[PDB]
C-alpha cells in the first residue's frame, strides 16, 4: 500500500507465531520489539536512541510478515516504547519514501 | 524525489539560516535537531525514545526547507544522536511510504 503520515504508520505483523503491531520506521536501522518470545540463541547488544542506550537481545534470521509481505532478518527484543520495523526489513518488502 | 532505504534517508535542510543534514524519520512524531541556534521564545519539554527521555527546547512556527520543500512548524532542539525530520513536517511536504 501507500501510507500517508497524518497518523503514525502502524501495520500488523506476525513474528515468532505471534501477532503484533509495529511502526514503519525509516529512522530505524534495525527492527525492535518488546514482549515477543523468539526461539533459539541470541546475543546481548546495547543500542542507542534519544534518551541514551537500551540493552536488547539480538536474534538473527527471524521470519516476519509485515502487512502481508514476507521478510527474514535480525530482530532485536527489548524495552522499546513502541515496536518498530527498521530498514533491515523495509528494504526486503520494497518500501520507499516519496515526496 | 523517491528515496530507497538501502542507506539512511538523509537529506539537506535549511533551518534558522543554517544548513544541516537530517534523517527522514517516519517513526518520529516531531522534528529534532542538535546544535542549531533558533531565535525567540521556547518552552522546555521532556520527550521519550528508546533509551529513556531527553530534555529539549520546543520552538514553534519555525520555517524549514527540507530537500528544497518549504514547511513551518515545531522544531525541538536537544541532544539527539542524529537530526530527524518527523511527521509534523513530512506531512507538509507530501511525504508518503510505499510498498
Ligand atoms: C535515530 C532515531 C530516530 C532511531 N529511532 C527510531 C525513531 O524512529 C524512534 C522510534 C521510536 C518511537 C517511539 C519510541 F518510544 C521509541 C522509538 N522515534 C523516537 O524516538 O521518537 C521520539 C521522539 C520524536 O517525536 C515523538 O515521536 C516518538 C518519540 C517522541 C519524541 S530508535 O527507536 O532510537 C532506533 C531504532 C532502531 C535502531 N536500530 C539501530 N541499529 C544500530 C545502529 C546500527 S539503532 C536504532 C535506534
Numbering used by the authors:
A (entry chain A), B (entry chain A): 1 to 99
What did the original publication write about this model?
Concomitantly, the 30 s loop lost its contacts with the flap region, which appears to become even more flexible, leading to a widened ligand binding pocket. This could be one of the main reasons for the reduced binding affinity of DRV towards PRDRVRP51, resulting in the emergence of DRV-resistance. The large side chain of Met-54 slightly pushes the flap loop away from the 80 s loop (residues 79–84), causing a shift toward Pro-81.
The inhibitors of HIV-1 protease (PR), an essential enzyme that cleaves gag and gag-pol polyproteins into mature functional proteins, are the key element of effective cART1,2. In the present studies, we designed and synthesized seven novel PIs that incorporate the unique 6-5-5 ring-fused crown-like tetrahydropyranofuran (Crn-THF) as a P2-ligand as in GRL-142, GRL-121, GRL-001, and GRL-003.
